[PDB]
Amino acid sequence: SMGYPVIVEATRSPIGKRNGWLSGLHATELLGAVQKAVVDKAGIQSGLHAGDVEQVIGGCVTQFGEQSNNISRVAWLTAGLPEHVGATTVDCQSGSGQQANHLIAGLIAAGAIDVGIACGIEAMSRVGLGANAGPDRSLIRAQSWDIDLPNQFEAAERIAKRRGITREDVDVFGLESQRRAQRAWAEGRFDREISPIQAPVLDEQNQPTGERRLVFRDQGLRETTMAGLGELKPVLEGGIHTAGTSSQISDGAAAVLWMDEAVARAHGLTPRARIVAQALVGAEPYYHLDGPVQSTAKVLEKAGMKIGDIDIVEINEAFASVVLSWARVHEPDMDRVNVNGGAIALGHPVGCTGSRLITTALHELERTDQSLALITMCAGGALSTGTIIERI
Amino acid sequence: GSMGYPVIVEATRSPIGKRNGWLSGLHATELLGAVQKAVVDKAGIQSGLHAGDVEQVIGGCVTQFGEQSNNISRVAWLTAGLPEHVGATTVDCQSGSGQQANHLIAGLIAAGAIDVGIACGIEAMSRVGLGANAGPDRSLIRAQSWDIDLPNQFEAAERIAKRRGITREDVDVFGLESQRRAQRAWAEGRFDREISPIQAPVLDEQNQPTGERRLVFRDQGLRETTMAGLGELKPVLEGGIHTAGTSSQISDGAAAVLWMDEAVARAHGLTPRARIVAQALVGAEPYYHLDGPVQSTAKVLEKAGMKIGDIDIVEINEAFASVVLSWARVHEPDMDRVNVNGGAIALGHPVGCTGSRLITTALHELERTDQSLALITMCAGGALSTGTIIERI
Ligand SMILES: CC(C)(COP(=O)(O)OP(=O)(O)OC[C@H]1O[C@@H](n2cnc3c(N)ncnc32)[C@H](O)[C@@H]1OP(=O)(O)O)[C@@H](O)C(=O)NCCC(=O)NCCS
Numbered sequence: 001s002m003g004y005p006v007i008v009e010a011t012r013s014p015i016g017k018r019n020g021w022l023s024g025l026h027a028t029e030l031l032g033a034v035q036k037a038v039v040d041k042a043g044i045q046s047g048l049h050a051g052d053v054e055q056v057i058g059g060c061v062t063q064f065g066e067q068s069n070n071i072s073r074v075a076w077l078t079a080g081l082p083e084h085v086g087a088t089t090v091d092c093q094s095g096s097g098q099q100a101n102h103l104i105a106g107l108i109a110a111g112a113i114d115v116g117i118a119c120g121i122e123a124m125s126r127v128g129l130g131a132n133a134g135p136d137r138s139l140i141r142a143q144s145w146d147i148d149l150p151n152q153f154e155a156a157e158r159i160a161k162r163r164g165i166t167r168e169d170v171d172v173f174g175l176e177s178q179r180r181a182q183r184a185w186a187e188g189r190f191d192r193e194i195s196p197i198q199a200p201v202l203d204e205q206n207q208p209t210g211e212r213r214l215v216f217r218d219q220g221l222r223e224t225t226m227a228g229l230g231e232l233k234p235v236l237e238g239g240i241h242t243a244g245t246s247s248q249i250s251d252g253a254a255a256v257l258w259m260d261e262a263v264a265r266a267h268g269l270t271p272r273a274r275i276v277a278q279a280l281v282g283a284e285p286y287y288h289l290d291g292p293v294q295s296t297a298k299v300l301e302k303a304g305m306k307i308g309d310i311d312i313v314e315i316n317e318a319f320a321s322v323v324l325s326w327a328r329v330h331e332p333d334m335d336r337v338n339v340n341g342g343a344i345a346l347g348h349p350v351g352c353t354g355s356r357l358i359t360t361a362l363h364e365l366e367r368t369d370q371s372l373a374l375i376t377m378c379a380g381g382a383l384s385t386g387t388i389i390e391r392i
Numbered sequence: 393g394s395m396g397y398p399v400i401v402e403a404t405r406s407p408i409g410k411r412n413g414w415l416s417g418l419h420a421t422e423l424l425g426a427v428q429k430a431v432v433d434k435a436g437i438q439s440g441l442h443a444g445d446v447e448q449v450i451g452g453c454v455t456q457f458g459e460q461s462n463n464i465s466r467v468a469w470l471t472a473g474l475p476e477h478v479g480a481t482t483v484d485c486q487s488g489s490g491q492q493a494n495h496l497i498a499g500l501i502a503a504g505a506i507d508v509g510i511a512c513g514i515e516a517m518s519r520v521g522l523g524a525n526a527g528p529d530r531s532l533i534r535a536q537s538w539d540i541d542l543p544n545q546f547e548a549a550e551r552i553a554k555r556r557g558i559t560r561e562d563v564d565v566f567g568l569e570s571q572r573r574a575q576r577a578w579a580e581g582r583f584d585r586e587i588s589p590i591q592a593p594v595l596d597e598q599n600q601p602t603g604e605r606r607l608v609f610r611d612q613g614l615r616e617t618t619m620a621g622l623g624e625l626k627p628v629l630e631g632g633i634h635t636a637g638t639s640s641q642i643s644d645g646a647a648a649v650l651w652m653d654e655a656v657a658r659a660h661g662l663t664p665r666a667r668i669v670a671q672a673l674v675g676a677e678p679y680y681h682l683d684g685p686v687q688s689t690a691k692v693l694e695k696a697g698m699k700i701g702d703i704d705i706v707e708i709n710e711a712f713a714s715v716v717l718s719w720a721r722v723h724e725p726d727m728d729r730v731n732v733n734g735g736a737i738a739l740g741h742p743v744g745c746t747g748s749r750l751i752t753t754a755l756h757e758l759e760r761t762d763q764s765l766a767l768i769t770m771c772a773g774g775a776l777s778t779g780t781i782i783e784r785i
């Protein structure tokens with residue numbers, strides 16, 4: 001009574017800007033929409049229906065208000081999907097929605113379920129970072145705490161210094177992300193993975209205009225240039241990172257439909273990819289967001305591969321210096337790294353990205369008819385997730 | 393690849409404190425950290441195993457706000473001074489969380505993702521109360537579209553009661569037995585093994601520390617109880633049958649369960665102690681809301697290929713007396729085998745913790761009585777129920 005988990009479908013909403021094109025939706029409606037999206041997608045070509053899903057696991061970071069009370073379950077019920085399907089919500093910060101695919105893969109593996117949905121939601125426009133704690137952030141740690149665990153903006157500086165990354169270095173990476181995202185969109189790469197989402201049109205204020213617009217484009221793309229990026233002011237006094245070279249605050253959701261390979265084939269669905277190796281490792285608190293070194297390491301070790309074997313990497317662009325520190329250590333081919341742009345241009349709904357990255361990856365492997373992809377992400381509390389997926 | 397054979401190797405819990413009770417002095421992260429260290433230490437007595445050997449931790453926690461925000465499982469671990477390379481995630485399927493957590497570690501072992509994991513659960517209700525995780529306007533945490541008749545939990549316990557013709561006497565009786573059975577277990581010593589005494593700040597008559605750091609080892613919810621006493625109590629809702637005497641207690645506690653691939657366990661010289669026969673987290677009927685233990689109990693029995701008769705020991709969480717009774721009315725088990733060591737009505741119910749607690753309590757009872765199969769099942773907010781059938785090895 002065990003199983004062989006495979007990705008059967010994956011899809012994502014477009015990613016909206018803060019107070020942008022999806023900010024009209026209640027966070028539970030966004031996630032619901034996407035949850036319904038994957039099931040519907042899989043229903044085109046098969047018998048599969050929402051009731052056939054057994055468990056849903058959703059990543060979400062700031063689990064407060066609209067994102068309190070186990071948003072994965074509420075989203076599901078709110079989309080009018082079947083009440084018998086279980087659902088759990090998870091937090092390993094920015095790893096959450098990646099970690100969620102690992103967990104569904106595990107339950108399938110253990111024979112607990114045959115059909116699962118991993119997903120991730122973040123509606124930063126509506127629940128901002130910090131919403132989940134009082135204003136006195138000193139209080140969310142015990143008085144004993146003495147770990148030099150810096151904030152994330154300081155972490156990107158500490159990492160940069162460690163590797164000798166410079167303001168020009170990042171501004172260049174920054175620019176390429178915008179360049180490559182703009183290229184993907186021009187060529188139509190994201191068309192398949194994206195599920196247009198209807199959304200309340202809001203006015204110049206943040207009130208609804210009665211209109212219900214269909215959104216299908218990532219809103220963070222922006223004509224960008226080395227000059228423009230050079231003009232931008234650092235986030236921290238003396239730091240190298242700016243809005244131009246950090247991720248964007250965003251609204252979005254993604255979902256990935258998993259099954260035991262045999263059940264999939266039985267419903268007449270095509271097994272599309274499988275996890276070769278997965279990991280959620282702890283990182284070094286001091287540098288905090290440099291974990292992608294460690295997670296990339298583990299899954300390569302577990303997979304019995306070397307970075308050379310990977311065709312496509314998705315390493316989340318929380319901060320330029322995170323991706324560059326990783327590249328400096330693991331020396332990959334940067335033509336294979338964030339080939340369709342990263343979060344610096346596409347934005348970074350925290351709980352969602354992990355499932356978004358897997359989604360993006362799978363599709364690119366399929367577009368280019370390649371095989372192995374690595375996904376890896378730094379995360380608050382000094383943790384990093386890692387996956388190597390493989391096309392089937 | 394390379395997959396695995398998940399088995400429980402160790403399990404432990406703090407005593408469960410009352411609201412503003414014996415553990416209310418501890419920051420929620422300290423409580424969880426203490427127990428996280430407890431299991432590993434326990435396993436270290438008889439083997440080489442050390443905290444660094446754990447690969448992933450997954451902790452259940454419901455009101456993930458403030459002290460319980462920012463992925464408590466991780467912070468708790470770091471705060472206990474345990475190794476920083478060990479990954480950790482925190483989960484919410486309400487009261488199911490800490491049970492769902494054992495499922496997920498069991499899956500990751502199964503999938504070959506890790507060889508050593510810790511499932512655990514924390515809730516420090518004294519310090520982060522239900523609701524903390526949302527603004528006062530609780531209308532706002534649902535979209536404006538929402539029209540599901542998903543009642544609050546106190547109303548759910550009434551709706552369920554009516555469905556099954558459960559009466560105030562019915563519940564008051566069950567309520568009383570829970571206190572009787574918890575009080576028996578403690579008298580005989582049943583919980584001694586599973587419990588890990590926790591050092592805690594002594595607080596005054598106010599809620600300020602007295603400088604004293606006392607060692608706590610007993611569940612604080614036990615209370616001389618009687619049918620008269622329970623009859624005296626006022627209902628929580630006007631016209632309801634449930635009272636504080638027959639609902640769960642608001643509590644502080646944590647529990648942790650060390651898993652491994654059976655082979656790795658044996659290699660470290662640790663004894664595989666139990667394994668999951670079947671697991672489930674099912675959706676329930678929104679209208680009745682907390683009657684999901686019918687469904688979850690059903691699924692795992694189905695999956696396990698067993699009937700309720702096969703189960704030696706049941707742990708069905710006593711959120712509300714009517715929840716257990718409704719279940720029993722449907723599944724007709726032997727109530728001598730149901731919550732044999734008392735339930736949350738007497739022992740309290742730290743929401744994010746209970747799930748891991750129940751598995752812990754069950755495993756130990758199977759061991760004490762030298763029996764084999766146990767069922768754990770819980771109702772949970774959002775109309776969900778977890779369910780596990782574990783088996784001694
Ligand atoms: C850094 C951060 C705060 C952004 O700050 P922000 O000022 O609110 O970002 P904005 O988009 O409002 O402003 C950034 C600027 O980039 C500028 N920009 C980018 N490319 C440009 C170009 N080619 N020419 C001119 N300007 C350009 C914009 O003009 C914009 O300023 P404006 O308001 O004058 O238009 C945000 O990206 C962030 O917090 N990221 C990470 C958060 C985090 O901790 N994440 C982890 C989650 S646990």
Ligand SMILES: CC(C)(COP(=O)(O)OP(=O)(O)OC[C@H]1O[C@@H](n2cnc3c(N)ncnc32)[C@H](O)[C@@H]1OP(=O)(O)O)[C@@H](O)C(=O)NCCC(=O)NCCS
Nearest residue numbers: 545616617618621622628635636637639640641642743773
């Ligand atoms: C119902 C609930 C609110 C308890 O209410 P409470 O009044 O705060 O409980 P207290 O312990 O303060 O009071 C209950 C009474 O039981 C009484 N009691 C019990 N046995 C008794 C006996 N034999 N003789 C006399 N009194 C007895 C106590 O005297 C006590 O009242 P007191 O303050 O006069 O001593 C709480 O149990 C609860 O909220 N439970 C469920 C919460 C929930 O939703 N959980 C799900 C999490 S998602």
